[PDB]
Protein backbone atom coordinates (compact mmCIF):
# COMPACT_ATOMS: atom_id res chain seq x y z
CA UNK A 1 0.00 0.00 0.00
CA UNK A 2 3.20 2.18 0.02
CA UNK A 3 2.40 3.09 3.68
CA UNK A 4 5.78 1.46 4.65
CA UNK A 5 7.48 4.91 4.61
CA UNK A 6 4.75 6.20 7.02
CA UNK A 7 5.49 3.34 9.52
CA UNK A 8 9.26 3.86 9.04
CA UNK A 9 8.52 7.50 10.08
CA UNK A 10 6.36 6.30 13.05
CA UNK A 11 9.49 4.46 14.42
CA UNK A 12 10.43 8.00 15.66
CA UNK A 13 7.00 8.91 17.17
CA UNK A 14 7.04 10.17 20.80
CA UNK A 15 4.31 7.59 21.67
CA UNK A 16 6.10 4.27 22.50
CA UNK A 17 2.94 2.35 21.55
CA UNK A 18 2.93 4.09 18.07
CA UNK A 19 6.62 3.12 17.52
CA UNK A 20 5.78 -0.48 18.71
CA UNK A 21 2.76 -0.59 16.33
CA UNK A 22 4.98 0.71 13.45
CA UNK A 23 7.50 -2.15 14.03
CA UNK A 24 4.67 -4.77 14.09
CA UNK A 25 3.03 -3.21 10.92
CA UNK A 26 6.42 -3.38 9.14
CA UNK A 27 6.84 -7.04 10.19
CA UNK A 28 3.38 -7.78 8.71
CA UNK A 29 4.28 -5.99 5.42
CA UNK A 30 7.44 -8.10 4.90
CA UNK A 31 9.37 -5.37 2.96
CA UNK A 32 13.24 -5.20 2.98
CA UNK A 33 13.18 -1.32 3.13
CA UNK A 34 12.12 -1.69 6.80
CA UNK A 35 15.30 -3.74 7.66
CA UNK A 36 17.76 -0.88 8.45
CA UNK A 37 15.15 1.24 10.36
CA UNK A 38 14.05 -1.88 12.37
CA UNK A 39 17.67 -2.85 13.26
CA UNK A 40 18.01 0.73 14.62
CA UNK A 41 14.74 0.21 16.64
CA UNK A 42 16.46 -2.71 18.55
CA UNK A 43 18.20 0.07 20.56
CA UNK A 44 14.85 1.83 21.38
CA UNK A 45 14.50 2.93 25.02
CA UNK A 46 11.20 0.99 25.34
CA UNK A 47 11.33 -2.85 25.86
CA UNK A 48 8.16 -3.40 23.73
CA UNK A 49 9.45 -1.47 20.67
CA UNK A 50 12.65 -3.60 20.82
CA UNK A 51 10.50 -6.83 21.05
CA UNK A 52 8.31 -5.68 18.14
CA UNK A 53 11.45 -4.85 16.03
CA UNK A 54 13.11 -8.30 16.78
CA UNK A 55 9.75 -9.97 15.87
CA UNK A 56 9.37 -7.91 12.66
CA UNK A 57 12.96 -8.62 11.57
CA UNK A 58 12.30 -12.38 12.12
CA UNK A 59 9.10 -12.17 9.99
CA UNK A 60 10.89 -10.23 7.20
CA UNK A 61 13.91 -12.60 7.26
CA UNK A 62 11.64 -15.65 7.09
CA UNK A 63 9.77 -14.18 4.10
CA UNK A 64 13.14 -13.40 2.36
CA UNK A 65 14.39 -17.01 2.98
CA UNK A 66 11.00 -18.48 1.93
CA UNK A 67 10.80 -16.47 -1.37
CA UNK A 68 14.43 -17.36 -2.24
CA UNK A 69 13.84 -21.09 -1.53
CA UNK A 70 10.51 -20.93 -3.49
CA UNK A 71 12.38 -19.59 -6.60
CA UNK A 72 14.88 -22.52 -6.27
CA UNK A 73 12.02 -25.10 -5.90
CA UNK B 1 3.73 24.96 18.30
CA UNK B 2 2.58 23.11 21.44
CA UNK B 3 -1.11 22.51 22.08
CA UNK B 4 -3.62 22.35 24.93
CA UNK B 5 -5.97 19.37 25.49
CA UNK B 6 -8.60 20.13 22.81
CA UNK B 7 -12.17 18.73 23.37
CA UNK B 8 -13.08 19.29 19.70
CA UNK B 9 -10.05 17.14 18.66
CA UNK B 10 -11.11 14.36 21.13
CA UNK B 11 -14.77 14.44 19.89
CA UNK B 12 -13.46 14.18 16.28
CA UNK B 13 -11.31 11.11 17.10
CA UNK B 14 -14.14 9.52 19.14
CA UNK B 15 -16.47 9.74 16.05
CA UNK B 16 -13.56 8.37 13.88
CA UNK B 17 -13.59 5.15 16.04
CA UNK B 18 -16.84 4.28 14.11
CA UNK B 19 -15.36 5.21 10.68
CA UNK B 20 -15.77 2.70 7.77
CA UNK B 21 -11.95 2.69 7.24
CA UNK B 22 -9.67 0.62 9.56
CA UNK B 23 -6.65 3.00 9.12
CA UNK B 24 -8.85 5.91 10.43
CA UNK B 25 -10.15 3.81 13.39
CA UNK B 26 -6.52 2.80 14.25
CA UNK B 27 -5.14 6.37 13.95
CA UNK B 28 -8.04 7.64 16.16
CA UNK B 29 -7.26 5.14 18.98
CA UNK B 30 -3.55 6.18 18.91
CA UNK B 31 -4.40 9.92 18.92
CA UNK B 32 -6.82 9.37 21.81
CA UNK B 33 -4.15 7.46 23.81
CA UNK B 34 -1.68 10.32 23.16
CA UNK B 35 -4.24 12.97 24.31
CA UNK B 36 -5.01 10.86 27.39
CA UNK B 37 -8.46 12.41 27.93
CA UNK B 38 -10.77 10.01 29.92
CA UNK B 39 -13.79 10.90 27.69
CA UNK B 40 -12.21 8.42 25.18
CA UNK B 41 -12.46 5.43 27.65
CA UNK B 42 -15.92 3.99 26.88
CA UNK B 43 -15.51 4.47 23.04
CA UNK B 44 -11.99 2.88 23.28
CA UNK B 45 -13.52 -0.07 25.20
CA UNK B 46 -16.05 -0.62 22.33
CA UNK B 47 -13.10 -0.52 19.85
CA UNK B 48 -11.50 -3.49 21.71
CA UNK B 49 -14.32 -5.54 20.02
CA UNK B 50 -13.59 -4.11 16.51
CA UNK B 51 -13.57 -6.59 13.58
CA UNK B 52 -9.98 -5.54 12.60
CA UNK B 53 -7.06 -6.77 14.81
CA UNK B 54 -5.07 -3.52 14.16
CA UNK B 55 -7.87 -1.45 15.76
CA UNK B 56 -8.21 -3.82 18.77
CA UNK B 57 -4.40 -3.61 19.26
CA UNK B 58 -4.56 0.22 19.09
CA UNK B 59 -7.53 0.41 21.49
CA UNK B 60 -5.73 -1.83 24.06
CA UNK B 61 -2.57 0.30 23.67
CA UNK B 62 -4.49 3.61 24.16
CA UNK B 63 -6.40 2.23 27.15
CA UNK B 64 -3.08 1.38 28.84
CA UNK B 65 -1.78 4.90 28.08
CA UNK B 66 -4.91 6.37 29.63
CA UNK B 67 -4.71 4.00 32.64
CA UNK B 68 -8.41 4.13 33.57
CA UNK B 69 -9.57 1.04 35.61
CA UNK B 70 -12.98 0.92 33.79
CA UNK B 71 -10.94 -0.81 31.07
CA UNK B 72 -9.86 -3.76 33.41
CA UNK B 73 -12.58 -6.28 32.66
CA UNK B 74 -12.67 -5.61 28.85
CA UNK B 75 -8.79 -5.85 28.78
CA UNK B 76 -9.04 -9.14 30.71
CA UNK B 77 -11.25 -10.42 27.79
CA UNK B 78 -8.74 -9.05 25.22
CA UNK B 79 -6.05 -11.23 26.94
CA UNK B 80 -8.04 -14.11 25.30
CA UNK B 81 -8.07 -12.51 21.82
CA UNK B 82 -7.18 -14.70 18.76
CA UNK B 83 -4.55 -12.07 17.77
CA UNK B 84 -1.20 -12.37 19.63
CA UNK B 85 -0.38 -8.64 19.45
CA UNK B 86 -3.86 -7.80 20.90
CA UNK B 87 -3.00 -10.15 23.88
CA UNK B 88 0.49 -8.56 24.28
CA UNK B 89 -1.09 -5.05 24.16
CA UNK B 90 -3.78 -6.00 26.70
CA UNK B 91 -1.17 -7.48 29.11
CA UNK B 92 0.92 -4.25 28.96
CA UNK B 93 -2.23 -2.11 29.47
CA UNK B 94 -3.28 -4.22 32.51
CA UNK B 95 0.20 -3.84 34.06
CA UNK B 96 -0.06 -0.04 33.56
CA UNK B 97 -3.48 0.10 35.26
CA UNK B 98 -2.10 -2.03 38.12
CA UNK B 99 -5.44 -3.48 39.22
CA UNK B 100 -5.02 -6.90 41.04
CA UNK B 101 -8.08 -8.43 39.22
CA UNK B 102 -5.61 -8.86 36.30
CA UNK B 103 -3.17 -11.12 38.33
CA UNK B 104 -4.86 -14.48 37.54
CA UNK B 105 -5.59 -13.80 33.81
CA UNK B 106 -1.90 -12.56 33.56
CA UNK B 107 -0.59 -15.76 35.28
CA UNK B 108 -2.47 -17.65 32.53
CA UNK B 109 -0.89 -15.37 29.85
CA UNK B 110 2.58 -16.34 31.13
CA UNK B 111 1.79 -19.67 29.33
CA UNK B 112 0.84 -18.02 26.02
CA UNK B 113 2.00 -19.65 22.74
CA UNK B 114 3.72 -16.30 21.73
CA UNK B 115 7.03 -15.40 23.39
CA UNK B 116 6.18 -11.61 23.14
CA UNK B 117 2.91 -12.12 25.05
CA UNK B 118 4.75 -14.10 27.81
CA UNK B 119 7.24 -11.22 28.33
CA UNK B 120 4.40 -8.70 28.58
CA UNK B 121 2.53 -10.94 31.14
CA UNK B 122 5.75 -11.29 33.27
CA UNK B 123 6.38 -7.53 33.06
CA UNK B 124 2.75 -6.74 34.04
CA UNK B 125 2.99 -9.14 37.00
CA UNK B 126 6.21 -7.44 38.16
CA UNK B 127 4.38 -4.07 38.02
CA UNK B 128 1.37 -5.28 40.01
CA UNK B 129 3.77 -6.80 42.60
CA UNK B 130 1.29 -9.50 43.79
CA UNK B 131 2.94 -12.63 45.45
CA UNK B 132 0.49 -15.01 43.74
CA UNK B 133 2.75 -14.58 40.63
CA UNK B 134 5.96 -16.02 42.35
CA UNK B 135 5.62 -19.78 41.62
CA UNK B 136 4.26 -19.13 38.04
CA UNK B 137 7.27 -16.77 37.49
CA UNK B 138 9.75 -19.34 38.93
CA UNK B 139 8.30 -21.82 36.38
CA UNK B 140 8.83 -19.26 33.49
CA UNK B 141 12.55 -19.27 34.40
CA UNK B 142 12.57 -22.54 32.30
CA UNK B 143 10.98 -20.84 29.28
CA UNK B 144 12.38 -21.82 25.86
CA UNK B 145 12.87 -18.07 25.14
CA UNK B 146 15.71 -16.20 26.86
CA UNK B 147 13.89 -12.83 26.87
CA UNK B 148 10.85 -14.55 28.53
CA UNK B 149 13.33 -16.08 31.09
CA UNK B 150 14.90 -12.65 31.86
CA UNK B 151 11.46 -10.99 32.06
CA UNK B 152 10.36 -13.57 34.69
CA UNK B 153 13.63 -13.00 36.58
CA UNK B 154 13.11 -9.16 36.42
CA UNK B 155 9.49 -9.54 37.68
CA UNK B 156 10.65 -11.67 40.67
CA UNK B 157 13.03 -8.85 41.61
CA UNK B 158 10.05 -6.41 41.49
CA UNK B 159 7.75 -8.47 43.74
CA UNK B 160 10.27 -9.22 46.52
CA UNK B 161 8.89 -10.37 49.88
CA UNK B 162 9.20 -13.60 51.97
CA UNK B 163 7.74 -15.94 49.30
CA UNK B 164 10.31 -14.73 46.68
CA UNK B 165 13.17 -14.85 49.26
CA UNK B 166 12.38 -18.49 50.36
CA UNK B 167 11.88 -19.56 46.72
CA UNK B 168 15.28 -18.00 45.65
CA UNK B 169 17.09 -19.47 48.75
CA UNK B 170 15.95 -22.94 47.61
CA UNK B 171 16.47 -22.47 43.82
CA UNK B 172 20.15 -21.36 44.34
CA UNK B 173 20.74 -25.02 45.53
CA UNK B 174 18.02 -27.01 43.66
CA UNK B 175 17.99 -25.17 40.36
CA UNK B 176 19.94 -25.65 37.13
CA UNK B 177 20.85 -23.29 34.25
CA UNK B 178 19.51 -19.76 34.15
CA UNK B 179 17.03 -20.32 37.06
CA UNK B 180 19.89 -21.20 39.44
CA UNK B 181 21.92 -18.09 38.31
CA UNK B 182 18.76 -15.94 38.90
CA UNK B 183 18.46 -17.25 42.47
CA UNK B 184 22.21 -16.83 43.22
CA UNK B 185 22.18 -13.24 41.81
CA UNK B 186 18.97 -12.48 43.74
CA UNK B 187 20.67 -13.65 46.99
CA UNK B 188 23.79 -11.40 46.31
CA UNK B 189 21.65 -8.30 45.46
CA UNK B 190 19.33 -8.78 48.54
Residue numbers in the entry:
A (entry chain A): 13 to 85
B (entry chain B): 7 to 196
Show the paper's wording.
We have recently reported the design of a new artificial repeat protein family named αRep. This design was based on a specific subgroup of helicoidal repeats commonly found in thermophilic microorganisms.
Target A3 is an αRep protein randomly picked from Lib1.0, previously reported as αRep-N4–a. The bA3–2 protein belongs to the same structural family as A3 but contains only one module between its N- and C-caps. The second α-helix (residues 86 to 108) from the bA3–2 C-cap has no defined electron density and mass spectrometry analysis revealed that the region encompassing residues 94 to 108 was proteolytically removed in this protein sample, presumably during crystallization. Despite this difference, bA3–2 is structurally very similar to A3 both in its apo-form (rmsd of 0.3 Å over 60 Cα atoms) or bound to bA3–2 (rmsd of 0.5 Å over 60 Cα atoms). bA3–2 and A3 interact via their concave faces which encompass the surface residues that are allowed to evolve.
